[PDB]
Structures are given as structure tokens and as C-alpha cells.
From Swiss-Prot, chain B:
3'-to-5' exoribonuclease specific for small oligoribonucleotides. Residues 7-168 form the Exonuclease domain. This is Oligoribonuclease. One of its GO terms (molecular function) is nucleic acid binding. Keywords: Cytoplasm, Exonuclease, Hydrolase, Nuclease. It is an enzyme of class 3 (hydrolase). It comes from Pseudomonas aeruginosa (strain ATCC 15692 / DSM 22644 / CIP 104116 / JCM 14847 / LMG 12228 / 1C / PRS 101 / PAO1).
Length: 180, 178
């Protein structure tokens, strides 16, 4: 079912924003076709981390991951960083060839930095380009502000809804900002 | 002549693809207004590096920076990474206030990562947004292949940035609905 024009959408949670200090603790993927129709929803994986890494989180991250239950999911998880990378790759290979899809979503430069450091095989599976919806948001803010303000950002508390809202944002810009 | 809506376009050359293990060897900038009209071209700067760093480049970078003349320019340069950062900031400060402009160009996540490691004062001068022309390039390839062929695309740094601006102008005129 591989297709070189299918898009890989990703969402990550981390202990913090610095790849040298921090690690990935949750990952999720969705594969769409070129026209943003969902083909398959990938595994949502809580990645195990030892207690000292969990205690090393700052105040905002200890509170947010604690209150969301992710911290307890991470503590209980029996899936290592490398195993989660392999689990995600096994899913994506059924749908997208290697080096075909850019990383798609929002704030994905930060995602690429974390994948490069902690999941280099998955990072290398993407095309080197980023498909970041926020480029369209920035251009719309300048050239068509009404399109940016008419986007209704739904709930993104959980990982698949988070990705789906990024797909919906791009879909919004295709319907109202892109000439076709 | 500062304007918070002006755009900083940047293009770097590096010794390799790893922002943490490799280094910057060339930089250039151009400032446009928010409607992509060029206001000023910044300095094009070859950044000195020790010979072992040049000798250590992989096969692709050894050939490409060799035949472009950059390898010789890096050897002959007396401008350090920090001096090149300061020269570029002195140009940009005349045109854009701090934190106002996104980083603008093709696949500029790569450039921002190198700046963050090697020229953090300059990296910090940008807004946190990335304006990535190659996001539109990929979208146009899949949704409007005719628009990607309409644009005819340069080893000189300022030519490279001019072509990134012209590529965005092409999408604004033939891909985006205003
Ligand atoms: Mn924002
Ligand atoms: Mn091209």
C-alpha cells in the first residue's frame, strides 16, 4: 500500500524543549494521502524513562505531564525509545516509502531536532523537508488575515486529536488560502 | 528604517549536515518588506575554519565547496564565526527590530539549527516562526504540479536568496488565493 506522495504526520511529547537535556516520552503518527484523507492512524506510544529522568523535569513539565497522566504512563511503560522508534517505523513502512514524505504538522522543526538526536533512523526515514502548517499561518496573517482568524482550533489534549487538528488546519488553508 | 513587518532572508553554507558536529562556512542575508520587495542586501561572508575541518568534510562537501571556490575563501578568510555574526547583526539592526521577523528561506529549519548552535545571538534576533518556502514547494508539487513547473530556478549566495524570494513570489501569484 506504499505511495510516494502519502504524508506522514507526527506529534511528540518531551520532558522539555532541549534535545541535549530532554527526551521523547510520547509519540503518535497519522498517514494521509496527498489530499489529506486519513489512510491509517498509527500507534500512540508512551516511552519508558527511569525515575531520575522524570525527576529532572522543570516545574511546568512536571506539572503538565503529571496532571495529564503521561508521567504515570511513562513510568509504567515497557517500551524503550528504540522500541518505540521501531514500532513506528514498522507502521509507516506499510504506507510510505523511505525519504518520500516531509515531516508534516505544526512546530515540526523542534520535532525533527528530537528525532535526529533520539530516533535517528526514524528521522532519516523522512524527506529532509518540513511541511509546517505555520508557514501558511504566517503568510495568511500578512496577506489574508481573515483566513487565519476563521480557523476554529478544536481540542488537542490527546495525541491523535492533536495531529487531526493540524490536518484540519492545513485543510482550512487549502480550502480558503490556496488557489485550485 | 526599522519596520517590524520586514522579513529577514538568510542562506548558509556548512561543512556538513549535522548542526551540532559541523560548522558554518558562509552566510548571507537579504531584507524584504512583507510584500517581498527587496529593501537591502546584506553582506556575504566566508567564515574561516581550521584546515583539519576543511580536510574532514565528506565527499559531497569536499567537491562542492572545492569547485565553488568556498573552500579557498574559507582558508583565506580572517573573519571568525563571531565576527561574521556581529557583521550580520549590524546590517539587520538597520532594517528589522529584534524578535519581529521569522527566519525566511528554503528549508530554513536547517539554517536555524546551525545558527542556534554557532551564532545564538543572531538566532535569537529572529521571531520564533519559520517561513519555509519549501513547505509551499511540497504543497504545490502535490496540489498544483503546473505551478511548480512554471517556475524556472545559482551558486552565488545572493543569487540563491533572490531565487528563494522569487520562488515565494511565484506561489503568492499563482498558488495562493488573495
Ligand atoms: Mn503561534
Ligand atoms: Mn526545486
Amino acid at each position: 500500500m506504499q505511495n510516494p506522495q502519502n504524508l506522514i504526520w507526527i506529534a511528540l511529547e518531551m520532558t522539555g524543549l532541549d534535545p541535549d537535556r530532554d527526551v521523547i516520552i510520547e509519540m503518535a503518527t497519522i498517514v494521509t494521502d496527498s489530499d489529506l484523507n486519513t489512510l491509517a492512524e498509527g500507534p500512540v506510544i508512551a516511552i519508558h524513562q527511569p525515575e531520575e529522568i522524570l525527576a529532572g523535569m522543570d516545574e511546568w513539565n512536571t506539572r503538565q505531564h503529571g496532571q495529564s497522566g503521561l508521567t504515570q504512563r511513562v513510568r509504567e511503560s515497557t517500551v524503550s525509545m528504540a522500541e518505540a522508534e521501531a514500532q513506528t517505523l514498522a507502521f509507516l513502512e506499510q504506507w510510505v516509502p523511505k525519504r518520500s514524505s516531509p515531516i508534516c504538522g505544526n512546530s515540526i522543526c523542534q520535532d525533527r531536532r528530537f528525532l535526529y538526536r533520539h530516533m535517528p533512523r526514524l528521522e532519516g526515514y523522512f524527506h529532509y523537508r518540513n511541511l509546517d502548517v505555520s508557514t501558511l499561518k504566517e503568510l495568511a496573517a500578512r496577506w489574508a488575515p481573515q483566513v487565519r482568524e476563521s480557523f476554529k482550533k478544536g481540542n488537542t489534549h490527546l495525541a491523535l486529536d492533536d495531529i487531526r487538528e493540524s490536518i484540519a488546519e492545513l485543510r482550512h488553508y487549502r480550502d480558503h488560502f490556496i488557489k485550485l
